[PDB]
Design a binder for this molecule. Structure first.
Ligand SMILES: [Fe+3]
Ligand SMILES: [Fe+3]
Ligand SMILES: [Mg+2]
Ligand SMILES: [Mg+2]
Lengths: 423, 423
């Protein structure tokens, strides 16, 4: 079994490092003064970057892989997506959900993602997708720690037996309580739904992840209730507000007042760049707003924010290969986090910040932690992002669970020349 | 002792007037048909303007005189002001509060101000500034009638034991119950805080003065709850909404609907021109809004509105000499109350309207009232405002408590010439 990871670069650290492994855990981390020779039981990072696993804090594995079945969304609109999904009703079965979820999960494993939080629609009396996902969670456990959010897609108070179904999902094992206040019939139902969500989270000792203010409505401010209730219960770490795209449209004065509460509350924020740029701003003509939450300001204020892919190859987001560096690339551009350091530190948005969002207790390259880490064939975060590098090796429990042999490009000039896109 | 004030001009009245004094009160007011000779026991207004004392309806004596201690606010922003104030923590003691409050109070006495309403931060378990201010109130009583507002700066529901501390402040003697709904974590806490504020005011029979909607947020409408609760309890006269700067950003239709309630409720409004122009509009780039409440429209509608200085020589407002004519000057310009009559009637904003805001029962040049009055070396309100004249004499209880010998300016042309800035 692997005993050491050598010649590793670490974000924010100078030089090369050696990571000693023992019994599936990291036993020690020592600096090197030069390049170490490879040997049996040693995985050579070859001066590449070693980081804890990529994390997917927000994805919908119950709808993934269905784009084009039976028809494609030609307009690319949310409205048509709903219609196209409805046309696939007959195919939505236990086995179908498991098959599609597993397909995307395999892409995630290949992409060095070892932690995934999937929302699952529980506005379904049969709870078909949930029962399927609970089995998938057990099956994929050796490679990915999957969290399931009981997501009341049609509302808690605005859907028949919505609250009862949400609680049933928790009784069946869902890890996180979801909500969607801006989709409830009224602002009052929205606020009330959050009180019910928090009550359930405290009753069952579960995390919370709200689809919060995902709308270009400057009056959608459910985020303040999410943060206030978290602060009141002293449970910020266990709470997440997903999307908050409405924040992109708030006036600056309210946002400034709100930020004090956001920081004090300690709650987490998830932005989903690929989907947000696609679905937001659809009611604008020109100019058209970007519609992503205030990521840059959150980072400047020390508020934990991270990036999710949200949808993969489905009616609402037709693209994706479940690649976090791709999600990061889009987020850095749309959020204008384009300074060298901002780009280089970008990896935090798809690693450490996301681990905090999932309230992970065993994450990071540190002595005592499980030997879960990935190797990127790049010098630093900037380089990894610029070249959209694959994951050379993914290690879990001290064992390699995925590897990618990089593409080899050659140009035939007066003589053949290898091209690696580095200067 | 003084028996008469002669050769006095009165706002809105033609000619000269004689004000007879007896036992510290105004015994009678008679018109003169010409200039009266001076004599023993007569204070000659010298055809200057005589008015009841200037009033300071909104100031923070607990933070006054601290600008630059230990460091100056270089950016001039609210944010830096908070940081600079926090750096002076070690100096905030009982004696320190009394010393600074007294320094500004002396400037106010010199400026003909005999009525002052100071807010005092009660979001402090030790209530240090409040205990100090209660002593100052007793000490300054011979010269100024000081009202103390128990101001829960950090919120009532959003601060630990906020409500208990607010009530404790009232039990200790605070004259007015304060609140700050737009600073509470949520809109719901904001509305609830007002119900609690009104309940306390009725329980202890105290006045109310809310820091209301002091934010450039078109959705901050706590003023409608303040007015509605006042109307419901039939206590408009005892209620004041300070700032309401958000009203500067409301759409006209809502404002028109709101105004009906504001008038019916009978509540008072305080605008703080010097601070509002400085702190509002800070989240705008260009164009930049003025951010003062709808003073002109309130006056046109018969809604009582007046001006306060708010801050004097502190981290949030670095300037000031506690001069009400200076506050008025700024307000007339920013509110565009620049017509001759609007400027001339401006004195009402710093005298009678402010007296109503403080619910004063002994104010005005009228027989039976205490002999509290000031003399301005000017022909009328317009002249006093244009030339920013000092208070020649301040009389309280029929005794002179302050006097200013005017500056003397001379230009040396072919011959020396006295300049008084009059045409
Ligand atoms: Fe989602
Ligand atoms: Fe104030
Ligand atoms: Mg979605
Ligand atoms: Mg203030």
């Amino acid at each position: 079994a692997l005993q050491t990871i050598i010649n590793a670069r670490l974000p924010g650290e100078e030089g090369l490092w050696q990571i000693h492994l023992q019994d599936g855990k990291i036993s020690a981390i020592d600096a090197q003064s030069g390049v170490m020779p490879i040997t049996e039981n040693s995985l050579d990072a070859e001066q590449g970057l070693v980081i804890p696993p990529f994390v997917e804090p927000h994805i919908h594995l119950d709808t993934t892989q269905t784009a084009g079945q039976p028809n494609w969304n030609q307009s690319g609109t949310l409205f048509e997506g709903i219609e196209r999904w409805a046309e696939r009703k007959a195919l939505l079965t236990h086995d179908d959900v498991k098959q599609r979820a597993w397909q995307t999960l395999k892409w995630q494993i290949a992409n060095g993602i070892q932690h995934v939080r999937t929302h699952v629609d529980v506005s379904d009396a049969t709870l078909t997708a949930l029962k399927a996902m609970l089995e998938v969670k057990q099956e994929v456990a050796p490679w990915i720690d999957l969290q399931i959010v009981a997501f009341p897609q049609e509302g808690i108070l605005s859907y028949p037996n919505g609250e009862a179904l949400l609680e049933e999902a928790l009784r069946l094992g869902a890890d996180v309580v979801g909500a969607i206040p801006h989709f409830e019939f009224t602002r009052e139902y929205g606020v009330e739904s959050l009180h019910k969500t928090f009550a359930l989270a405290q009753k069952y000792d579960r995390l919370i992840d709200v689809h919060c203010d995902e709308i270009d409505d400057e009056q959608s401010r459910f985020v303040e209730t999410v943060a206030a209730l978290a602060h009141h219960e002293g449970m910020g770490a266990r709470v997440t507000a997903s999307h908050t795209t409405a924040m992109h449209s708030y006036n600056g004065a309210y946002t400034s007042r709100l930020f004090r509460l956001l920081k004090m509350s300690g709650i987490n924020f998830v932005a989903n760049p690929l989907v947000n740029i696609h679905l937001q701003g659809r009611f604008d003509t020109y100019p058209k707003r970007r519609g992503i939450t205030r990521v840059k300001e959150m980072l400047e204020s020390g508020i934990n924010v991270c990036f999710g892919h949200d949808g993969v190859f489905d009616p609402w987001y037709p693209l994706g290969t479940a690649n976090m560096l791709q999600v990061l690339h889009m987020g850095l551009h749309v959020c204008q986090l384009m300074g060298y350091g901002q780009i280089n530190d970008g990896l935090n948005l798809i690693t450490h910040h996301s681990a905090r969002t999932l309230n992970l207790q065993d994450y990071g390259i540190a002595a005592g932690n499980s030997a879960n880490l990935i190797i990127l064939p790049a010098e630093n975060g900037f380089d990894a992002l610029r070249r959209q590098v694959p994951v050379r090796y993914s290690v879990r429990g001290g064992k390699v669970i995925a590897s990618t042999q990089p593409a080899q490009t050659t140009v035939y000039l007066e003589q053949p020349e290898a091209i690696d896109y580095k200067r």
